Amino acid sequence: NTIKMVVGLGNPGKEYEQTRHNAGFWFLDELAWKWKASFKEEKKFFGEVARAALPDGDVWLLKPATFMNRSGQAVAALAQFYKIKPEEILVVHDELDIPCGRIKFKLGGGNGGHNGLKDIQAKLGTADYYRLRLGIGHPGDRNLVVGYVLNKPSAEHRRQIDDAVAKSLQAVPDIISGKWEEATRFLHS
Numbered sequence: 001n002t003i004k005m006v007v008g009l010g011n012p013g014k015e016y017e018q019t020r021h022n023a024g025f026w027f028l029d030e031l032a033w034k035w036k037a038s039f040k041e042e043k044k045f046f047g048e049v050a051r052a053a054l055p056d057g058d059v060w061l062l063k064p065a066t067f068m069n070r071s072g073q074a075v076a077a078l079a080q081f082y083k084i085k086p087e088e089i090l091v092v093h094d095e096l097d098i099p100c101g102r103i104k105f106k107l108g109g110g111n112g113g114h115n116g117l118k119d120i121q122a123k124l125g126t127a128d129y130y131r132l133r134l135g136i137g138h139p140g141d142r143n144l145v146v147g148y149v150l151n152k153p154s155a156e157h158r159r160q161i162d163d164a165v166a167k168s169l170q171a172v173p174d175i176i177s178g179k180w181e182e183a184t185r186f187l188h189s
């Protein structure tokens with residue numbers, strides 16, 4: 001198959017475990033569940049890794065423990081050990097420009113100021129990796145953005161985000177076999 005590694009973004013520690021900026025982590029903890037994988041700390045990859053058993057080829061799951069703006073250090077290390085190209089990687093992140101429970105998909109392109117995406121583009125040497133974008137909404141002024149992502153959504157949007165990841169979990173066969181148009185048409189409904 002295609003896409004060899006799936007990455008979830010977040011900050012480490014329990015003081016960040018419930019914040020919006022950890023939405024990627026929330027997806028991965030459930031994607032691991034779908035594939036019966038478990039997490040082990042790999043120091044050499046700077047994070048927690050999991051092997052996902054698939055008939056067409058194993059898929060690696062990674063949550064970096066680098067802090068967000070150093071996320072690329074973990075991604076580049078994993079792709080280094082197992083010889084994985086940028087276009088064979090999917091990264092799951094929070095997306096302000098769409099509201100809670102919306103979900104959108106693209107390959108490469110702009111990052112919308114995300115500090116994790118920034119470092120991953122910096123360390124892989126290109127923007128050309130796949131992104132699963134999870135809506136978390138946005139405040140009124142973007143001078144407020146940093147404080148917004150570092151806080152709990154809670155209640156309604158947490159439920160809408162769980163629905164978001166549930167609906168994202170059904171598109172993964174087409175994502176991994178590589179059917180961009182198919183998964184993109186399923187997700188944008």
Ligand SMILES: CC(=O)Nc1ccc(-c2csc(N)n2)cc1
Nearest residue numbers: 094095096112113114115146149
């Ligand atoms: C000092 C610090 O926390 N910087 C930072 C930079 C960018 C972002 C960001 C952009 S779009 C999104 N969802 N998050 C968050 C935080």
